[PDB]
Short mmCIF file of C-alpha atoms and ligand atoms in Angstrom, two decimals:
data_model
loop_
_atom_site.label_atom_id
_atom_site.label_comp_id
_atom_site.label_asym_id
_atom_site.label_seq_id
_atom_site.Cartn_x
_atom_site.Cartn_y
_atom_site.Cartn_z
CA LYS A 8 -6.02 -20.70 21.58
CA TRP A 9 -3.17 -18.41 22.84
CA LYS A 10 -0.65 -21.32 22.61
CA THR A 11 -1.16 -21.31 18.78
CA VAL A 12 -1.17 -17.44 18.43
CA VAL A 13 2.39 -17.34 19.96
CA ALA A 14 3.36 -20.28 17.64
CA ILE A 15 2.14 -18.29 14.53
CA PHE A 16 3.95 -15.15 15.89
CA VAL A 17 7.25 -17.16 16.14
CA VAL A 18 6.81 -18.41 12.50
CA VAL A 19 6.02 -14.81 11.25
CA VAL A 20 9.01 -13.18 13.12
CA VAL A 21 11.26 -16.03 11.73
CA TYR A 22 9.75 -15.42 8.22
CA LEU A 23 10.62 -11.65 8.46
CA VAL A 24 14.25 -12.26 9.66
CA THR A 25 14.71 -15.06 7.01
CA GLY A 26 13.02 -12.99 4.27
CA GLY A 27 14.90 -9.83 5.27
CA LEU A 28 18.26 -11.64 4.92
CA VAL A 29 17.23 -12.96 1.43
CA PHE A 30 16.25 -9.40 0.25
CA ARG A 31 19.53 -7.95 1.68
CA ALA A 32 21.54 -10.58 -0.29
CA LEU A 33 19.53 -9.75 -3.49
CA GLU A 34 19.40 -5.90 -3.23
CA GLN A 35 22.50 -4.71 -1.22
CA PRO A 36 24.95 -5.53 -4.17
CA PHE A 37 22.71 -3.41 -6.49
CA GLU A 38 22.35 -0.61 -3.85
CA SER A 39 26.16 -0.53 -3.40
CA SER A 40 26.54 -0.24 -7.23
CA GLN A 41 23.99 2.62 -7.58
CA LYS A 42 25.62 4.46 -4.59
CA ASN A 43 28.92 4.53 -6.56
CA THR A 44 27.26 5.40 -9.93
CA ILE A 45 25.40 8.59 -8.66
CA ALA A 46 28.58 9.79 -6.81
CA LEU A 47 30.64 9.28 -10.04
CA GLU A 48 27.94 10.93 -12.25
CA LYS A 49 27.65 14.02 -9.94
CA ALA A 50 31.48 14.36 -9.77
CA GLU A 51 31.68 14.02 -13.60
CA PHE A 52 29.09 16.83 -14.04
CA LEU A 53 31.09 19.29 -11.85
CA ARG A 54 34.35 18.15 -13.59
CA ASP A 55 32.98 18.89 -17.12
CA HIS A 56 30.86 21.95 -16.12
CA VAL A 57 33.47 24.00 -14.19
CA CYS A 58 31.14 27.10 -14.00
CA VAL A 59 28.86 25.04 -11.58
CA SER A 60 29.68 24.92 -7.82
CA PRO A 61 29.09 21.68 -5.76
CA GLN A 62 26.50 23.51 -3.56
CA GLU A 63 24.58 24.98 -6.60
CA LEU A 64 24.44 21.38 -7.96
CA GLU A 65 22.82 20.05 -4.72
CA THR A 66 20.33 22.98 -4.78
CA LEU A 67 19.18 21.94 -8.32
CA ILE A 68 19.03 18.19 -7.39
CA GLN A 69 16.99 19.10 -4.24
CA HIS A 70 14.66 21.30 -6.41
CA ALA A 71 14.26 18.37 -8.89
CA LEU A 72 13.55 15.95 -5.99
CA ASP A 73 11.04 18.38 -4.34
CA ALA A 74 9.17 18.63 -7.69
CA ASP A 75 9.15 14.79 -7.97
CA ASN A 76 7.80 14.48 -4.36
CA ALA A 77 4.99 16.94 -5.31
CA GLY A 78 4.24 14.83 -8.42
CA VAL A 79 5.72 17.09 -11.14
CA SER A 80 8.25 15.43 -13.52
CA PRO A 81 11.51 17.50 -13.54
CA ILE A 82 12.15 16.19 -17.11
CA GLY A 83 11.21 18.52 -20.00
CA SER A 90 -1.82 16.65 -15.34
CA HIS A 91 -2.04 14.03 -12.52
CA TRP A 92 -5.25 15.46 -10.97
CA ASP A 93 -7.61 15.44 -14.03
CA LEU A 94 -11.20 13.99 -13.67
CA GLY A 95 -9.86 10.58 -14.84
CA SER A 96 -6.54 10.43 -12.91
CA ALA A 97 -8.14 11.81 -9.68
CA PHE A 98 -10.87 9.10 -10.01
CA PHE A 99 -8.14 6.41 -10.28
CA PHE A 100 -6.27 7.92 -7.25
CA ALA A 101 -9.55 7.83 -5.25
CA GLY A 102 -9.81 4.10 -6.12
CA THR A 103 -6.10 3.65 -5.18
CA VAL A 104 -7.03 4.86 -1.60
CA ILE A 105 -10.31 2.80 -1.42
CA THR A 106 -8.67 -0.54 -2.50
CA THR A 107 -5.82 0.12 0.11
CA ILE A 108 -3.26 -0.26 -2.78
CA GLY A 109 -1.88 3.30 -2.22
CA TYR A 110 0.83 3.42 -4.94
CA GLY A 111 2.37 6.76 -3.91
CA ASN A 112 3.18 8.20 -7.38
CA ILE A 113 0.15 10.52 -6.82
CA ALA A 114 -0.19 11.54 -3.13
CA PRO A 115 -1.92 14.54 -1.38
CA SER A 116 0.61 17.40 -0.93
CA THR A 117 -1.89 20.05 0.40
CA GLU A 118 -2.60 20.11 4.19
CA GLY A 119 -6.34 20.19 3.31
CA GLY A 120 -5.84 17.41 0.75
CA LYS A 121 -4.34 15.24 3.51
CA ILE A 122 -7.26 16.02 5.92
CA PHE A 123 -9.75 14.88 3.23
CA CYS A 124 -7.57 11.79 2.40
CA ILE A 125 -7.77 10.73 6.12
CA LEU A 126 -11.61 11.04 6.11
CA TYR A 127 -11.96 9.54 2.58
CA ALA A 128 -10.04 6.39 3.68
CA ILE A 129 -11.77 5.99 7.11
CA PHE A 130 -15.34 6.36 5.63
CA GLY A 131 -14.36 4.74 2.30
CA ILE A 132 -12.33 1.51 2.80
CA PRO A 133 -15.28 -0.24 4.72
CA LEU A 134 -17.66 0.95 1.88
CA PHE A 135 -15.43 -1.01 -0.57
CA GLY A 136 -15.73 -3.98 1.83
CA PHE A 137 -19.49 -4.07 1.11
CA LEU A 138 -18.92 -4.17 -2.70
CA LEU A 139 -16.13 -6.76 -2.39
CA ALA A 140 -18.40 -8.80 -0.02
CA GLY A 141 -21.30 -8.50 -2.49
CA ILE A 142 -19.29 -9.84 -5.45
CA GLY A 143 -17.78 -12.30 -2.91
CA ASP A 144 -21.29 -13.65 -2.07
CA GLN A 145 -22.13 -13.83 -5.82
CA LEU A 146 -18.91 -15.76 -6.73
CA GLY A 147 -19.57 -18.05 -3.75
CA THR A 148 -22.85 -19.13 -5.45
CA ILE A 149 -20.83 -20.01 -8.63
CA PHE A 150 -18.16 -21.99 -6.63
CA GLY A 151 -20.71 -23.70 -4.33
CA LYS A 152 -22.81 -24.90 -7.29
CA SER A 153 -19.64 -26.20 -9.07
CA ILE A 154 -18.39 -28.22 -6.01
CA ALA A 155 -22.00 -29.58 -5.58
CA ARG A 156 -21.94 -30.67 -9.29
CA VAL A 157 -18.61 -32.56 -8.74
CA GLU A 158 -20.01 -33.95 -5.38
CA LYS A 159 -23.03 -35.25 -7.40
CA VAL A 160 -20.55 -37.41 -9.41
CA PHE A 161 -17.40 -38.15 -7.23
CA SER A 167 -13.89 -37.80 0.21
CA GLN A 168 -15.52 -34.31 0.51
CA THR A 169 -12.10 -32.75 1.37
CA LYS A 170 -10.52 -34.19 -1.87
CA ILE A 171 -13.41 -32.71 -3.97
CA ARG A 172 -12.94 -29.34 -2.18
CA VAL A 173 -9.09 -29.25 -2.60
CA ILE A 174 -9.21 -30.23 -6.37
CA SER A 175 -12.01 -27.68 -7.19
CA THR A 176 -10.37 -24.81 -5.18
CA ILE A 177 -6.97 -25.28 -6.98
CA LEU A 178 -8.92 -25.06 -10.30
CA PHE A 179 -10.73 -21.86 -9.08
CA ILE A 180 -7.28 -20.43 -8.07
CA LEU A 181 -5.68 -21.34 -11.46
CA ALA A 182 -8.81 -19.99 -13.31
CA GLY A 183 -8.16 -16.58 -11.68
CA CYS A 184 -4.40 -16.92 -12.34
CA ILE A 185 -5.14 -16.91 -16.12
CA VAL A 186 -8.08 -14.39 -16.38
CA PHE A 187 -6.89 -11.87 -13.66
CA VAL A 188 -3.12 -12.53 -13.48
CA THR A 189 -1.68 -13.89 -16.80
CA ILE A 190 -4.02 -12.18 -19.41
CA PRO A 191 -3.78 -8.61 -17.81
CA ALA A 192 0.06 -8.94 -17.41
CA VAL A 193 0.25 -9.76 -21.19
CA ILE A 194 -1.85 -6.58 -21.94
CA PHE A 195 0.41 -4.46 -19.61
CA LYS A 196 3.54 -5.86 -21.39
CA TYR A 197 2.22 -4.46 -24.73
CA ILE A 198 0.54 -1.19 -23.52
CA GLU A 199 3.09 0.04 -20.89
CA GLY A 200 6.00 -1.72 -22.66
CA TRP A 201 7.39 -3.41 -19.50
CA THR A 202 9.43 -6.68 -19.39
CA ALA A 203 7.77 -10.15 -18.95
CA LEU A 204 8.84 -10.01 -15.23
CA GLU A 205 7.74 -6.36 -14.50
CA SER A 206 4.27 -7.05 -16.00
CA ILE A 207 3.61 -10.13 -13.75
CA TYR A 208 5.34 -8.28 -10.82
CA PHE A 209 3.02 -5.23 -11.23
CA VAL A 210 -0.13 -7.47 -11.40
CA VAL A 211 1.04 -9.36 -8.20
CA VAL A 212 1.94 -6.08 -6.32
CA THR A 213 -1.48 -4.60 -7.43
CA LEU A 214 -3.77 -7.59 -6.59
CA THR A 215 -1.97 -8.17 -3.20
CA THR A 216 -2.99 -4.48 -2.42
CA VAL A 217 0.74 -3.91 -1.55
CA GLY A 218 1.17 -1.21 -4.25
CA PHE A 219 4.79 0.01 -4.02
CA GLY A 220 4.21 2.56 -6.81
CA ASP A 221 7.53 1.67 -8.56
CA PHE A 222 5.27 0.51 -11.46
CA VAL A 223 1.95 2.31 -12.10
CA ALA A 224 -0.42 1.70 -15.04
CA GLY A 225 -1.03 4.91 -17.01
CA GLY A 226 2.06 6.80 -15.82
CA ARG A 233 -6.17 6.18 -24.22
CA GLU A 234 -8.93 7.81 -22.07
CA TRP A 235 -10.70 4.46 -21.29
CA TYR A 236 -7.39 2.94 -19.95
CA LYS A 237 -7.26 4.20 -16.27
CA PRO A 238 -11.05 3.48 -15.52
CA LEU A 239 -10.73 -0.01 -17.16
CA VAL A 240 -7.56 -0.66 -15.03
CA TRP A 241 -9.62 0.08 -11.84
CA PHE A 242 -12.50 -2.15 -13.08
CA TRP A 243 -9.91 -4.98 -13.52
CA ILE A 244 -8.69 -4.32 -9.91
CA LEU A 245 -12.31 -4.46 -8.58
CA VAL A 246 -13.16 -7.82 -10.32
CA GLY A 247 -9.62 -9.25 -9.81
CA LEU A 248 -9.67 -8.53 -6.07
CA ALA A 249 -13.32 -9.64 -5.68
CA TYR A 250 -12.51 -13.05 -7.25
CA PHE A 251 -9.53 -13.99 -5.04
CA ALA A 252 -11.27 -12.41 -1.96
CA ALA A 253 -14.22 -14.83 -2.62
CA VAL A 254 -11.80 -17.86 -2.83
CA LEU A 255 -10.00 -16.71 0.41
CA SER A 256 -13.43 -16.27 2.12
CA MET A 257 -14.51 -19.77 0.93
CA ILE A 258 -11.24 -21.39 2.27
CA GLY A 259 -11.40 -19.46 5.58
CA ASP A 260 -15.07 -20.35 6.26
CA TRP A 261 -14.18 -24.08 5.78
CA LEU A 262 -11.16 -23.88 8.17
CA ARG A 263 -13.32 -22.33 10.98
CA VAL A 264 -16.01 -25.03 10.28
CA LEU A 265 -13.23 -27.73 10.43
CA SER A 266 -11.93 -26.04 13.67
CA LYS A 267 -15.36 -26.73 15.31
CA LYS B 8 -28.59 -10.45 -3.59
CA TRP B 9 -27.48 -9.01 -7.00
CA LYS B 10 -30.00 -6.11 -6.67
CA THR B 11 -27.99 -4.83 -3.64
CA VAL B 12 -24.50 -5.50 -5.25
CA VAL B 13 -25.43 -3.11 -8.14
CA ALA B 14 -26.78 -0.61 -5.51
CA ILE B 15 -23.38 -0.71 -3.62
CA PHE B 16 -21.54 -0.43 -7.02
CA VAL B 17 -23.54 2.77 -7.85
CA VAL B 18 -22.67 4.28 -4.39
CA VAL B 19 -18.92 3.35 -4.81
CA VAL B 20 -18.66 4.75 -8.43
CA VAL B 21 -20.47 7.95 -7.18
CA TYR B 22 -18.03 8.07 -4.17
CA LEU B 23 -15.00 7.88 -6.57
CA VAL B 24 -16.32 10.62 -8.95
CA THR B 25 -17.33 12.84 -5.92
CA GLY B 26 -14.04 12.14 -4.08
CA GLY B 27 -11.99 12.60 -7.25
CA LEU B 28 -13.52 16.07 -7.82
CA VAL B 29 -12.74 17.07 -4.17
CA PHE B 30 -9.06 15.94 -4.53
CA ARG B 31 -8.75 17.78 -7.91
CA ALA B 32 -10.04 21.01 -6.26
CA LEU B 33 -7.56 20.56 -3.34
CA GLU B 34 -4.41 19.44 -5.28
CA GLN B 35 -4.61 20.88 -8.88
CA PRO B 36 -3.87 24.53 -7.64
CA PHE B 37 -0.74 23.18 -5.83
CA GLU B 38 0.27 20.98 -8.85
CA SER B 39 -0.08 24.04 -11.19
CA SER B 40 2.17 26.03 -8.78
CA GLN B 41 4.90 23.33 -8.55
CA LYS B 42 4.82 22.89 -12.40
CA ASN B 43 5.76 26.61 -12.74
CA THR B 44 8.35 26.47 -9.87
CA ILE B 45 10.50 23.63 -11.37
CA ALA B 46 10.29 25.17 -14.91
CA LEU B 47 11.52 28.55 -13.53
CA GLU B 48 14.26 26.89 -11.40
CA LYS B 49 15.60 24.79 -14.35
CA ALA B 50 15.59 27.88 -16.64
CA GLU B 51 17.38 29.92 -13.90
CA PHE B 52 20.11 27.23 -13.61
CA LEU B 53 20.88 27.29 -17.38
CA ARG B 54 20.71 31.15 -17.33
CA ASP B 55 23.31 31.44 -14.50
CA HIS B 56 25.44 28.41 -15.56
CA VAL B 57 25.98 29.23 -19.29
CA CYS B 58 28.59 26.37 -19.67
CA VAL B 59 25.68 23.82 -19.15
CA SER B 60 23.50 22.76 -22.15
CA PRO B 61 19.70 22.08 -21.70
CA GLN B 62 20.20 18.39 -22.71
CA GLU B 63 23.18 17.87 -20.29
CA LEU B 64 20.90 19.30 -17.54
CA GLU B 65 18.13 16.71 -18.27
CA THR B 66 20.79 13.92 -18.30
CA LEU B 67 21.88 14.91 -14.72
CA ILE B 68 18.23 15.25 -13.50
CA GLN B 69 17.42 11.78 -14.99
CA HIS B 70 20.60 10.35 -13.33
CA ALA B 71 19.47 11.90 -9.98
CA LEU B 72 15.92 10.51 -10.48
CA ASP B 73 17.25 7.02 -11.47
CA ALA B 74 19.32 6.96 -8.23
CA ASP B 75 16.22 8.02 -6.21
CA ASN B 76 14.10 5.25 -7.89
CA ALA B 77 16.83 2.72 -6.89
CA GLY B 78 16.70 4.08 -3.30
CA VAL B 79 20.00 6.04 -3.23
CA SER B 80 19.75 9.72 -2.14
CA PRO B 81 21.37 11.95 -4.83
CA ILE B 82 22.14 14.50 -2.04
CA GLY B 83 25.70 14.47 -0.61
CA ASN B 84 28.21 11.61 -0.19
CA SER B 90 22.05 1.68 3.89
CA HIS B 91 18.35 0.77 3.24
CA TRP B 92 18.94 -3.03 3.18
CA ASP B 93 20.58 -3.59 6.64
CA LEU B 94 19.28 -6.48 8.90
CA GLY B 95 17.04 -3.86 10.60
CA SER B 96 15.62 -2.01 7.53
CA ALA B 97 15.28 -5.26 5.42
CA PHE B 98 13.25 -6.82 8.31
CA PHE B 99 10.93 -3.75 8.29
CA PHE B 100 10.61 -3.94 4.45
CA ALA B 101 9.67 -7.65 4.75
CA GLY B 102 6.92 -6.61 7.22
CA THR B 103 5.88 -3.78 4.81
CA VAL B 104 5.15 -6.51 2.15
CA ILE B 105 3.43 -8.93 4.64
CA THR B 106 1.03 -6.27 6.09
CA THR B 107 0.15 -5.19 2.43
CA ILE B 108 1.15 -1.57 3.40
CA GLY B 109 3.88 -1.42 0.68
CA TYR B 110 5.19 2.14 1.29
CA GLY B 111 7.48 2.42 -1.75
CA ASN B 112 10.63 4.21 -0.41
CA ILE B 113 12.31 0.73 -0.27
CA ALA B 114 11.33 -1.46 -3.27
CA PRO B 115 13.09 -4.42 -5.05
CA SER B 116 15.13 -3.11 -8.03
CA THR B 117 16.93 -6.42 -8.88
CA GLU B 118 15.17 -8.88 -11.27
CA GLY B 119 15.83 -11.62 -8.68
CA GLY B 120 14.64 -9.38 -5.84
CA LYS B 121 11.30 -8.84 -7.65
CA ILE B 122 10.93 -12.67 -8.27
CA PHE B 123 11.45 -13.32 -4.52
CA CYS B 124 9.08 -10.38 -3.63
CA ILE B 125 6.30 -12.08 -5.72
CA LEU B 126 6.81 -15.43 -3.88
CA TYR B 127 7.31 -13.75 -0.45
CA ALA B 128 3.94 -11.92 -0.81
CA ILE B 129 1.96 -14.94 -2.21
CA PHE B 130 3.20 -17.35 0.55
CA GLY B 131 3.40 -14.59 3.19
CA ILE B 132 0.28 -12.34 3.21
CA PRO B 133 -2.09 -15.32 4.13
CA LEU B 134 0.44 -16.33 6.92
CA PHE B 135 -0.08 -12.82 8.40
CA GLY B 136 -3.83 -13.46 8.12
CA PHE B 137 -3.47 -16.30 10.67
CA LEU B 138 -1.50 -14.06 13.12
CA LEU B 139 -4.03 -11.19 12.83
CA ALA B 140 -6.87 -13.77 13.16
CA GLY B 141 -5.23 -15.27 16.26
CA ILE B 142 -4.89 -11.89 18.03
CA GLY B 143 -8.41 -11.09 16.68
CA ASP B 144 -9.79 -14.29 18.31
CA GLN B 145 -8.23 -13.21 21.65
CA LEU B 146 -9.56 -9.59 21.42
CA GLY B 147 -13.08 -10.97 20.85
CA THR B 148 -12.88 -12.54 24.35
CA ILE B 149 -11.88 -9.08 25.75
CA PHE B 150 -14.78 -7.44 23.77
CA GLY B 151 -17.44 -10.04 24.72
CA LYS B 152 -16.57 -9.68 28.44
CA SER B 153 -16.55 -5.83 28.21
CA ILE B 154 -19.97 -5.73 26.38
CA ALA B 155 -21.39 -8.06 29.14
CA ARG B 156 -19.95 -5.65 31.81
CA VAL B 157 -21.72 -2.64 30.12
CA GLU B 158 -24.92 -4.83 29.75
CA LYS B 159 -24.68 -5.44 33.56
CA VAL B 160 -25.05 -1.63 34.04
CA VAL B 166 -32.05 -0.55 27.18
CA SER B 167 -31.99 -2.74 24.00
CA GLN B 168 -29.04 -5.11 23.24
CA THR B 169 -28.34 -3.21 19.95
CA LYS B 170 -27.99 0.13 21.88
CA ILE B 171 -25.57 -1.62 24.35
CA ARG B 172 -23.54 -2.93 21.32
CA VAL B 173 -23.47 0.61 19.75
CA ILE B 174 -22.26 2.19 23.08
CA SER B 175 -19.71 -0.71 23.43
CA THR B 176 -18.44 -0.40 19.78
CA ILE B 177 -18.02 3.44 20.14
CA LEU B 178 -16.14 2.74 23.43
CA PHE B 179 -13.89 0.13 21.69
CA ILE B 180 -13.10 2.44 18.69
CA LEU B 181 -12.29 5.38 21.07
CA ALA B 182 -10.02 3.03 23.11
CA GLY B 183 -8.03 2.11 19.97
CA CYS B 184 -8.11 5.74 18.76
CA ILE B 185 -6.07 6.74 21.87
CA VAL B 186 -3.68 3.71 22.30
CA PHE B 187 -3.01 2.94 18.53
CA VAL B 188 -3.84 6.30 16.86
CA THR B 189 -3.30 9.35 19.20
CA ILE B 190 -0.38 8.08 21.44
CA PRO B 191 1.80 6.76 18.47
CA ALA B 192 1.13 9.95 16.39
CA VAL B 193 2.41 12.02 19.41
CA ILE B 194 5.61 9.83 19.51
CA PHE B 195 6.07 10.21 15.68
CA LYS B 196 5.65 14.04 16.03
CA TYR B 197 8.66 14.11 18.44
CA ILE B 198 10.89 11.37 16.87
CA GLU B 199 10.43 12.07 13.10
CA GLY B 200 9.70 15.78 13.73
CA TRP B 201 6.54 15.91 11.55
CA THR B 202 3.59 18.37 11.97
CA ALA B 203 0.50 17.52 14.14
CA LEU B 204 -1.37 16.72 10.85
CA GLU B 205 1.41 14.61 9.17
CA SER B 206 1.78 12.46 12.33
CA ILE B 207 -2.00 11.57 12.50
CA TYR B 208 -2.03 11.30 8.63
CA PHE B 209 0.90 8.80 8.66
CA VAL B 210 -0.76 6.65 11.41
CA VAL B 211 -4.09 6.64 9.39
CA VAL B 212 -2.31 5.81 6.04
CA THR B 213 -0.30 3.04 7.88
CA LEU B 214 -3.19 1.30 9.77
CA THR B 215 -5.50 1.49 6.70
CA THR B 216 -2.68 -0.58 4.93
CA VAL B 217 -2.81 2.12 2.16
CA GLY B 218 0.87 3.13 2.67
CA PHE B 219 1.61 5.86 0.09
CA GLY B 220 5.27 6.10 1.16
CA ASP B 221 5.21 9.96 1.15
CA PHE B 222 5.88 9.61 4.92
CA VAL B 223 7.87 6.60 6.22
CA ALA B 224 8.95 6.01 9.87
CA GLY B 225 12.73 5.59 10.16
CA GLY B 226 13.56 7.17 6.79
CA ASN B 227 15.21 10.55 7.51
CA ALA B 228 18.95 10.37 6.63
CA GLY B 229 19.63 13.34 8.96
CA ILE B 230 18.03 11.43 11.90
CA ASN B 231 20.12 9.14 14.18
CA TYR B 232 17.40 6.61 15.26
CA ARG B 233 17.64 3.92 17.99
CA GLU B 234 17.99 0.18 17.07
CA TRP B 235 14.68 -0.83 18.81
CA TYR B 236 12.72 1.88 16.84
CA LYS B 237 12.00 0.13 13.42
CA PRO B 238 10.92 -3.33 14.91
CA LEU B 239 8.79 -1.66 17.67
CA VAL B 240 7.16 0.55 14.95
CA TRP B 241 6.32 -2.73 13.10
CA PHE B 242 5.09 -4.27 16.41
CA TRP B 243 2.78 -1.21 16.77
CA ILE B 244 1.52 -2.02 13.20
CA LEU B 245 0.77 -5.66 14.27
CA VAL B 246 -1.17 -4.85 17.52
CA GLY B 247 -2.72 -1.72 15.91
CA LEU B 248 -3.98 -3.61 12.85
CA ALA B 249 -5.02 -6.67 14.92
CA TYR B 250 -7.21 -4.44 17.17
CA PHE B 251 -9.09 -2.59 14.37
CA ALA B 252 -9.33 -5.85 12.31
CA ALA B 253 -10.98 -7.58 15.35
CA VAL B 254 -13.39 -4.57 15.69
CA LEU B 255 -14.27 -4.78 11.91
CA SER B 256 -14.72 -8.60 12.16
CA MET B 257 -17.06 -8.10 15.17
CA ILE B 258 -19.31 -5.48 13.36
CA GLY B 259 -19.44 -7.63 10.18
CA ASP B 260 -20.36 -10.78 12.19
CA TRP B 261 -23.33 -8.91 13.81
CA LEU B 262 -24.54 -7.48 10.44
CA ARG B 263 -24.60 -11.00 8.85
CA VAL B 264 -26.46 -12.29 11.99
CA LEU B 265 -28.93 -9.34 11.65
CA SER B 266 -29.20 -10.14 7.86
CA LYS B 267 -30.50 -13.66 8.76
CA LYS B 268 -32.68 -12.40 11.71
C1 TRD C 1 -11.74 -3.47 1.83
C2 TRD C 1 -10.25 -3.70 1.69
C3 TRD C 1 -9.83 -4.40 0.39
C4 TRD C 1 -8.35 -4.82 0.32
C5 TRD C 1 -8.00 -6.16 1.01
C6 TRD C 1 -7.98 -7.37 0.09
C7 TRD C 1 -6.83 -8.34 0.37
C8 TRD C 1 -6.58 -9.38 -0.73
C9 TRD C 1 -5.52 -10.41 -0.40
C10 TRD C 1 -5.31 -11.48 -1.45
C11 TRD C 1 -4.50 -12.67 -0.97
C12 TRD C 1 -3.45 -13.19 -1.96
C13 TRD C 1 -2.41 -14.15 -1.38
C1 TRD C 2 -3.76 -10.26 5.76
C2 TRD C 2 -3.44 -8.78 5.92
C3 TRD C 2 -4.68 -7.90 5.77
C4 TRD C 2 -4.42 -6.38 5.85
C5 TRD C 2 -5.65 -5.51 5.52
C6 TRD C 2 -6.51 -5.16 6.72
C7 TRD C 2 -7.30 -3.86 6.54
C8 TRD C 2 -7.79 -3.26 7.87
C9 TRD C 2 -8.62 -1.99 7.72
C10 TRD C 2 -9.24 -1.51 9.03
C11 TRD C 2 -10.30 -0.44 8.86
C12 TRD C 2 -9.77 1.00 8.94
C13 TRD C 2 -10.80 2.07 8.59
K1 K C 3 1.39 1.35 -0.92
K1 K C 4 -3.13 -3.00 1.54
K1 K C 5 -0.81 -0.75 0.32
#
């Protein structure tokens, strides 16, 4: 119904204005602080190093930023067979971190075609594992239904399936990332959330051991496939309940 | 069937190795060039400015990089205004997650986790709602083509017609606008639109991000509204093709 589509649109637009005001309140005091710190650090450099002009300073900062935008660290390979395989998977999963991004005009042209004829291909694999996990969930709810309202059985089992994935694909990998990457308890859970939601800001990237990067993508594939199966299972029920 | 899941997995793993080798061939010569450029530029700075030590140089570069990671441009003398913060909220919700604007505060990250978990499925409803309305537009248009040959051939000619319709209204027309407003190349404009609608969002190109550009107030929310209708249309097209394939799988 169109009366409900407008109602959801009102909720979403309210959620963005509300959410936007919460983020502003949480990040603008930090942004204001960092704006003052870089201005004071740049002024301190020119104050101590008299031989440097303010324009020659900006030229170097711009050169350091241009190198960073290309993917080269201006401190002290990102396209090796392993890293380029992980970047390909970063496009396919729609995560798109941004730490590694095509800089060549030709590299962009291929990235456009690789996403268009690649993201639906991943849909098939995610749907396949989705159909397989459905068989596991369906048999488990039928086992509880053989013992135990149908809605109460469905809600209890689903929450357990959700929490099962929250330990195996959310908690356990965040613990591994806290030890390997050396991030904080927050940053590890934050990265896992930002990765599995396919948001992928790129502010935290795993592998930034040889078996690490391919095993990280395999975790993404199973991790996504599991929650995608639960979301499919809940959706299918809602449309059945709608009829 | 599990026999087909393994078959798709083989194709996907082949597609990543193949694709990865193509990207390496296209980007490693450029990466090798930029690696030499920054090394020569840093050495030239210390050569001309004798009074600067190599360690004091790295300290400044790291300070400039730390400011950039926070979202503050280390060039010359806000990203969280009611306008930009609304667009960032939408960037989380749509799962695009560009990167230019990202939570740096511990508390901001905690809220970002909760805002995505209890927000991305809410967007699902909105995209499903518009997708349920577009299906009515598609079903009537397929019936109009069928009024003018097998049903599958009609569906193929109708699907091509629907994709081409969206490729002009949500892909070509907005890329043309972005080429004039942002000032990007003909490639970068189409590339940004593709990277945006695919919900990939690298953040290498972000609409309403140039400091030296004096944008209008209606720009950023209308750009997000384009994302909504744009995504909704291609999501409805994808839901339609999938539905038919599962129907064909049974029959
Ligand atoms: C073929 C595209 C794959 C990426 C989309 C998966 C979305 C997962 C959303 C999880 C929901 C968590 C609240
Ligand atoms: C609940 C938000 C879902 C966002 C992901 C949708 C992906 C759409 C891809 C369309 C196909 C383009 C080739
Ligand atoms: K992204
Ligand atoms: K995404
Ligand atoms: K993304």
